[PDB]
Write an enzyme that holds these catalytic residues in place. Sequence first.
Site, PDB file in Angstrom:
ATOM      1  N   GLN A   1       0.822  -1.205   0.000  1.00  0.00           N
ATOM      2  CA  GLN A   1       0.000   0.000   0.000  1.00  0.00           C
ATOM      3  C   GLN A   1       0.858   1.257   0.000  1.00  0.00           C
ATOM      4  O   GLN A   1       0.612   2.193  -0.774  1.00  0.00           O
ATOM      5  CB  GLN A   1      -0.928  -0.013   1.212  1.00  0.00           C
ATOM      6  CG  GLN A   1      -1.806   1.209   1.329  1.00  0.00           C
ATOM      7  CD  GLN A   1      -3.119   0.903   2.002  1.00  0.00           C
ATOM      8  OE1 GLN A   1      -3.186   0.075   2.906  1.00  0.00           O
ATOM      9  NE2 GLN A   1      -4.178   1.564   1.560  1.00  0.00           N
ATOM     10  N   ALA A   2       1.869   1.300   0.869  1.00  0.00           N
ATOM     11  CA  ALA A   2       2.717   2.483   0.968  1.00  0.00           C
ATOM     12  C   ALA A   2       3.453   2.730  -0.339  1.00  0.00           C
ATOM     13  O   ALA A   2       3.490   3.859  -0.844  1.00  0.00           O
ATOM     14  CB  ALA A   2       3.707   2.320   2.116  1.00  0.00           C
TER      15      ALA A   2
ATOM     16  N   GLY B   1       5.239  -5.490   1.938  1.00  0.00           N
ATOM     17  CA  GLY B   1       6.394  -4.671   1.622  1.00  0.00           C
ATOM     18  C   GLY B   1       7.707  -5.220   2.132  1.00  0.00           C
ATOM     19  O   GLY B   1       8.765  -4.811   1.649  1.00  0.00           O
TER      20      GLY B   1
ATOM     21  N   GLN C   1       0.948   3.964  -3.109  1.00  0.00           N
ATOM     22  CA  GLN C   1       0.491   5.344  -2.975  1.00  0.00           C
ATOM     23  C   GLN C   1       1.632   6.330  -3.220  1.00  0.00           C
ATOM     24  O   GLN C   1       1.430   7.390  -3.836  1.00  0.00           O
ATOM     25  CB  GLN C   1      -0.141   5.546  -1.601  1.00  0.00           C
ATOM     26  CG  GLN C   1      -1.409   4.728  -1.416  1.00  0.00           C
ATOM     27  CD  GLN C   1      -2.026   4.889  -0.048  1.00  0.00           C
ATOM     28  OE1 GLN C   1      -1.339   5.192   0.922  1.00  0.00           O
ATOM     29  NE2 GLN C   1      -3.331   4.683   0.036  1.00  0.00           N
TER      30      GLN C   1
ATOM     31  N   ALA D   1      -0.846 -10.301   2.947  1.00  0.00           N
ATOM     32  CA  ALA D   1       0.069 -10.881   3.921  1.00  0.00           C
ATOM     33  C   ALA D   1      -0.466 -10.750   5.339  1.00  0.00           C
ATOM     34  O   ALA D   1      -0.160 -11.587   6.192  1.00  0.00           O
ATOM     35  CB  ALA D   1       1.438 -10.215   3.811  1.00  0.00           C
TER      36      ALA D   1
ATOM     37  N   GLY E   1       3.616  -6.605   5.934  1.00  0.00           N
ATOM     38  CA  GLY E   1       3.973  -7.956   5.546  1.00  0.00           C
ATOM     39  C   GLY E   1       4.324  -8.060   4.076  1.00  0.00           C
ATOM     40  O   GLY E   1       5.314  -8.697   3.709  1.00  0.00           O
TER      41      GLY E   1
ATOM     42  N   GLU F   1      27.976   6.492 -11.177  1.00  0.00           N
ATOM     43  CA  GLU F   1      28.935   7.377 -10.462  1.00  0.00           C
ATOM     44  C   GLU F   1      28.305   7.798  -9.131  1.00  0.00           C
ATOM     45  O   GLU F   1      29.042   7.878  -8.129  1.00  0.00           O
ATOM     46  CB  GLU F   1      29.286   8.596 -11.317  1.00  0.00           C
ATOM     47  CG  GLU F   1      28.359   9.780 -11.104  1.00  0.00           C
ATOM     48  CD  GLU F   1      28.637  10.967 -12.010  1.00  0.00           C
ATOM     49  OE1 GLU F   1      28.183  12.079 -11.680  1.00  0.00           O
ATOM     50  OE2 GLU F   1      29.304  10.774 -13.045  1.00  0.00           O
TER      51      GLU F   1
ATOM     52  N   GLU G   1       5.644  -4.595  13.788  1.00  0.00           N
ATOM     53  CA  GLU G   1       6.606  -3.903  12.933  1.00  0.00           C
ATOM     54  C   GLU G   1       8.053  -4.312  13.182  1.00  0.00           C
ATOM     55  O   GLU G   1       8.783  -4.505  12.192  1.00  0.00           O
ATOM     56  CB  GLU G   1       6.463  -2.386  13.105  1.00  0.00           C
ATOM     57  CG  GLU G   1       5.576  -1.734  12.073  1.00  0.00           C
ATOM     58  CD  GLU G   1       5.519  -0.230  12.221  1.00  0.00           C
ATOM     59  OE1 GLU G   1       5.960   0.281  13.271  1.00  0.00           O
ATOM     60  OE2 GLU G   1       5.033   0.445  11.289  1.00  0.00           O
TER      61      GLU G   1
HETATM   62  N1  LIG Z   1       4.894   7.476   3.665  1.00  0.00           N
HETATM   63  C1  LIG Z   1       3.819   6.699   3.612  1.00  0.00           C
HETATM   64  N2  LIG Z   1       3.765   5.554   4.375  1.00  0.00           N
HETATM   65  C2  LIG Z   1       2.676   4.754   4.328  1.00  0.00           C
HETATM   66  C3  LIG Z   1       1.609   5.077   3.514  1.00  0.00           C
HETATM   67  N3  LIG Z   1       0.672   4.120   3.661  1.00  0.00           N
HETATM   68  C4  LIG Z   1       1.122   3.202   4.543  1.00  0.00           C
HETATM   69  N4  LIG Z   1       2.359   3.590   4.973  1.00  0.00           N
HETATM   70  C5  LIG Z   1       3.225   2.879   5.923  1.00  0.00           C
HETATM   71  O1  LIG Z   1       3.057   1.481   5.804  1.00  0.00           O
HETATM   72  C6  LIG Z   1       3.351   0.887   7.046  1.00  0.00           C
HETATM   73  C7  LIG Z   1       2.647  -0.448   7.218  1.00  0.00           C
HETATM   74  O2  LIG Z   1       2.534  -1.148   6.001  1.00  0.00           O
HETATM   75  P1  LIG Z   1       1.074  -1.650   5.558  1.00  0.00           P
HETATM   76  O3  LIG Z   1       0.068  -0.587   5.922  1.00  0.00           O
HETATM   77  O4  LIG Z   1       0.722  -2.955   6.231  1.00  0.00           O
HETATM   78  O5  LIG Z   1       1.121  -1.788   3.957  1.00  0.00           O
HETATM   79  P2  LIG Z   1       1.867  -3.016   3.237  1.00  0.00           P
HETATM   80  O6  LIG Z   1       3.350  -2.768   3.218  1.00  0.00           O
HETATM   81  O7  LIG Z   1       1.323  -3.208   1.847  1.00  0.00           O
HETATM   82  O8  LIG Z   1       1.530  -4.316   4.111  1.00  0.00           O
HETATM   83  P3  LIG Z   1       0.157  -5.111   3.867  1.00  0.00           P
HETATM   84  O9  LIG Z   1      -0.987  -4.136   3.757  1.00  0.00           O
HETATM   85  O10 LIG Z   1      -0.078  -6.072   5.002  1.00  0.00           O
HETATM   86  O11 LIG Z   1       0.281  -5.883   2.581  1.00  0.00           O
HETATM   87  C8  LIG Z   1       2.907   1.893   8.091  1.00  0.00           C
HETATM   88  O12 LIG Z   1       3.808   1.936   9.171  1.00  0.00           O
HETATM   89  C9  LIG Z   1       2.864   3.221   7.362  1.00  0.00           C
HETATM   90  O13 LIG Z   1       3.751   4.148   7.947  1.00  0.00           O
HETATM   91  C10 LIG Z   1       1.658   6.225   2.744  1.00  0.00           C
HETATM   92  O14 LIG Z   1       0.713   6.513   2.018  1.00  0.00           O
HETATM   93  N5  LIG Z   1       2.766   7.038   2.794  1.00  0.00           N
HETATM   94 MG   LIG Z   2      -2.170  -4.112   2.228  1.00  0.00          MG
END
Ligand SMILES: Nc1nc2c(ncn2[C@@H]2O[C@H](COP(=O)(O)OP(=O)(O)OP(=O)(O)O)[C@@H](O)[C@H]2O)c(=O)[nH]1
Ligand SMILES: [Mg+2]
EC number: 3.6.5.-
Lengths: 440, 338, 429
Positions: free
Chosen positions: A11-12, A146, A15, A99, A144, A254, A183
């Site tokens: 998700q992070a 990521g 986005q 995950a 999970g 470089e 985490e």
């Molecule tokens: N900078 C930033 N961080 C994000 C954003 N959305 C989620 N995060 C970070 O993602 C972290 C947790 O990961 P998840 O929300 O579980 O997303 P994911 O990596 O796809 O893991 P799963 O949803 O279980 O597949 C959090 O600690 C957030 O800080 C975003 O839009 N911008």
């Molecule tokens: Mg997710």
Amino acid sequence: MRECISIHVGQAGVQIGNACWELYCLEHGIQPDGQMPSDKTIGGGDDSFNTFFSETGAGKHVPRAVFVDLEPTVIDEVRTGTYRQLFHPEQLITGKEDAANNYARGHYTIGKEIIDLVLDRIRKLADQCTGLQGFLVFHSFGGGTGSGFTSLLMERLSVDYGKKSKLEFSIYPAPQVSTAVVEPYNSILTTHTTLEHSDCAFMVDNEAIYDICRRNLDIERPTYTNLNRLISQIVSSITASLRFDGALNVDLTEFQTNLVPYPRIHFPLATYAPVISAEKAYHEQLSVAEITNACFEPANQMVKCDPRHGKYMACCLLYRGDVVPKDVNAAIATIKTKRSIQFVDWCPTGFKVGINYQPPTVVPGGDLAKVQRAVCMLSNTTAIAEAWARLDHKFDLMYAKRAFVHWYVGEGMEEGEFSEAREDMAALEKDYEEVGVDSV
Amino acid sequence: KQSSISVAVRVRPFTEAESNRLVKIDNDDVGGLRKIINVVDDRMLIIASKRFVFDRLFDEDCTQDQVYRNTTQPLLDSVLDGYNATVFAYGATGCGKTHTISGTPEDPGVIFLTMKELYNRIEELKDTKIIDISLSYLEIYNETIRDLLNPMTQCKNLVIREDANNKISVSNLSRHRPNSVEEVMQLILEGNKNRTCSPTEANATSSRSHAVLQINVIQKDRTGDITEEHTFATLSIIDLAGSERAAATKNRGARLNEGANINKSLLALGNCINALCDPRRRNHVPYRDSKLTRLLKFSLGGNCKTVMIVCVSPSSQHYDETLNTLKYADRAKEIKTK
Amino acid sequence: MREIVHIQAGQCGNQIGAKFWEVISDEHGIDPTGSYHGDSDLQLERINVYYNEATGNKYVPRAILVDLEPGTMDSVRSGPFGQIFRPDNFVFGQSGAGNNWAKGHYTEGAELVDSVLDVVRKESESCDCLQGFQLTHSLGGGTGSGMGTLLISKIREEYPDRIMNTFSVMPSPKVSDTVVEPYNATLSVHQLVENTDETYCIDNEALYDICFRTLKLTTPTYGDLNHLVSATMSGVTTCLRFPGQLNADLRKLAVNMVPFPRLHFFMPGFAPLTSRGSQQYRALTVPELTQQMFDSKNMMAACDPRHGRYLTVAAIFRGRMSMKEVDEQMLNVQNKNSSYFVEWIPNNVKTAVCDIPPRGLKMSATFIGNSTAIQELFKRISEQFTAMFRRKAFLHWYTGEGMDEMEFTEAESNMNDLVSEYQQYQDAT
Ligand SMILES: Nc1nc2c(ncn2[C@@H]2O[C@H](COP(=O)(O)OP(=O)(O)OP(=O)(O)O)[C@@H](O)[C@H]2O)c(=O)[nH]1
Ligand SMILES: [Mg+2]
Ligand SMILES: CC(=O)O[C@H]1C(=O)[C@@]2(C)[C@H]([C@H](OC(=O)c3ccccc3)[C@]3(O)C[C@H](OC(=O)[C@H](O)[C@@H](NC(=O)c4ccccc4)c4ccccc4)C(C)=C1C3(C)C)[C@]1(OC(C)=O)CO[C@@H]1C[C@@H]2O
Ligand SMILES: Nc1nc2c(ncn2[C@@H]2O[C@H](COP(=O)(O)OP(=O)(O)O)[C@@H](O)[C@H]2O)c(=O)[nH]1
């Protein structure tokens, strides 16, 4: 040509990729539906977009991107959003549960049933590539997906390509703020992939950017859109030299050569100087010296760690806009004059400078102000070890009682692997401590 | 204080073919015969790239006779005295667990020597006591109990009931009263025939269920008159399926969940053992987390001798498995010292 | 994708489920006839989580109704949303349990369990990807507790690796209307501790207190209690159906909230609960939502969290809001009340955010606590159990149906083991 392949996992990452491609389309004048009216209006024929986009016969430009997630909510958001017509339909999803925030599920159980599609699409993109430079992978340690799927994907990429560059842009967990309970486990588990496979990993946390938004941008209630826009600005600053002409270009090869001093030490911090609201855009000169000094403040760092508690080991300053080299040299001399900024004795050169003539672009509706000059500072320093240490402690507090471990071992992970990742992180911290000592 | 859980870890000797085909690299450099798992002391093993401390370290030259005399002979004395006893066996595939616990007719295993000395001891004690032996053999699979000696029994019959007098007594379990070690081994083979198994990787007979053998010894007076004092004891011989990572697995499906359950069970067992060794956690021990720990609720405390035969290999093909096994062994007594 | 099977058993479960389906249909803009009359494309996007298509544009909820007497089935079929359900899904006997766990589990329910399992198999096979099941029942009753736990055992045997949820209505010390509640509750908990991944404990006393005091309702009925439980149920699974900023399915909540395999008994809550008269005299912001969320008197489990420590907490917000505010507020709650949180977990709060608030509300939130204090509830039941078991007050009714005293002793021992396990982590360490 100078192509780079962007991959977004979780998700992070997805986005952040949305923000990144918004900024890129604004930069190159490409409409959301893929057509570029400038070529029809003027004629074009001399623009530079091969770094990220690829043409077709009809004039549509498709990005060199791969959006990956283990559940369909975010990618279905993209499929029906403003930029639905931009990407290729190969935005890959798992039509099943995600995950659910654990490394084992993302890496071993359910992440192996989409990796074939991801690798096939990456191969297809690379076949269209003639001058491929590297991979820009976006993910998050905490999640999970990521963590686990990123580990698996980077392992497969290292097996396949190997010689090509790989750059990571990850959301490290913050010291105090957190949005999940497990985490530390995932973050420690990602240590092996970050060490062995990645060539240079840029680390970010939400807390530091929240503080930056509160102080600089004068935003009291910031959401993830602002964080993603800032990270997109940093990433665009990194890759600006592959797209526009400049006085001193800096390619990725470089870049890593002068940033990374040793093979295992490839964890630099990143920061962006002229983060300023339109209200504060006035009352300020924002000269080269001002922004260069602003880069080195502890408050402006995008990772919640104190640079003053460690010695700078390398620095790279990438300038955009109306910047003259003499002003940059004067600014660097001023920075070297300062006493608080300590540099290791075995790096007398210290700084690398790149300059680009394209000024920063402003996203419409964004909260950053239009500026003439900007600079992005990427610094390899020993301060980041402190951050690792605090997360290290968290891991111990949850591993003494084996809390939440049954969820992980129920998805193909062995109990012994946790200690192995812990020892790898300890070795990395020891190496970072060792390099900081003055020579004798 | 002295405690009751002891760890004895043994190193498998190289076979002729593996030694011949892997020592060439060592000869050329000085193939993967690096002697990774070596020994420097009876209670310490620093040759793993790290230092581990164990209650007993059993070397390459250690044969079966001294193995029995050192690891499990006092358990027979304890069980004849009237206290429960238990011996676990743990080792990944190719680690010689079968060779040590069972052996071949030329080289008898631990079970052969233990049964033989138990039968000799009761033969000696016949003059003053009447002693009888009851044998049972059961399998734990996906948190379900199955009678190996009496198959076709439904899984719902075999359940655990907490007896008021500190007994488990799994219901509807077939019982046998063999009179000699030979028929004991015949019964053991009969049970092993019914053991659940499936081909995995290149191996065809990888066990994927925990196995438990219970020997209930009941003793009573012969040359005297007393009202009710038998204090019957139990000896447990437990074979634990080796851990496994989904990464090796490809078929997934029922093989996944099965394997997952195995890991969970092992984790639960480890916690229980750790919870028993640490005096701080004496308030509560997580017995209920798995069927095996519940079955051994009273067979791990301080008033009952427990041992664990950890079998490893020195080859490089099983370096990760051997390190995981050593880490699991260290879980029982995490005496982190140098 | 990520589709849930809903099962209802007993009078309490059937009533709660009817109210739940009314609330969900209103949320998704589904007519009582089963047609769609929404005003937003987002409602239809993920409607298949709870509903199934039907040829004439209709939508049939994926519900399974179970009982042992046809009175509740007739009442539900004649209700406002009676016609929405599939007629084939109605399963019921003729001889009720009579507030007897043995009849519900062994004698009567054993006949109907085959038909119920066949209907469950038919519903689940047609599903694309089965997220898991969702049972609703009460542990203090008859057919509810017994047939419920039987169905949980059967489904766990048939679908071992799918998330299981049970919205159990626990018995109360004050508000009790069945003499043999301790036996039924103990016997059902003995199964729920083994064969479930989540268990949202709900108590009638807490809901009555919320209705009297927080909502200032002069004459609550079971409709209002069902309304609150329905709000919780809709809130918990909101991330599957709508987009958000931090998605969190059922499995993510289970992974974050459950540290050990047995501690999966949760206290739910719904934040924005205020009387009609007092709505205008307060704003609607994240900090006060959080303050009402963690208020000890807003919990539905009838357990004081101040008498224990939070093993874990999960907060699911709904509406447009800033993530900085949410994270800052959760951190402030954790730091300010450090005595009520376990030291050996660095962060006890799992946050999720959804972008669609429920209908006429700017933004709302749902709370799922997992605290040691719940053990007190079991302790209460255990006391009553022994108070009736030393003398065998009503044991002959249960033994007549084929039970045995050893099963009662096993259930009591298991409950005591659970209570001791919960008390292990409450002590400072
Ligand atoms: N900078 C930033 N961080 C994000 C954003 N959305 C989620 N995060 C970070 O993602 C972290 C947790 O990961 P998840 O929300 O579980 O997303 P994911 O990596 O796809 O893991 P799963 O949803 O279980 O597949 C959090 O600690 C957030 O800080 C975003 O839009 N911008
Ligand atoms: Mg997710
Ligand atoms: C003008 C206005 O503000 O109207 C509100 C209202 O007055 C208040 C008091 C509502 C009202 O709720 C109650 O008074 C109530 C009574 C008994 C039990 C539960 C609630 C309301 O009834 C509740 C109702 O809520 C909803 O519509 C939600 O979507 C809710 N669904 C239903 O109530 C519903 C029930 C049956 C059929 C159709 C819809 C919901 C809540 C959570 C998750 C999903 C849906 C609304 C708008 C109001 C009234 C009508 C007065 C409140 O709503 C909830 C559910 O918390 C109570 O505290 C809030 C705050 C609101 O201000
Ligand atoms: N919330 C709620 N609880 C109920 C309702 N009806 C009964 N109960 C509770 O359920 C318990 C009785 O269980 P019951 O429904 O008779 O079980 P069953 O006979 O097996 O279906 C009582 O303690 C009540 O508190 C209802 O409509 N709503």
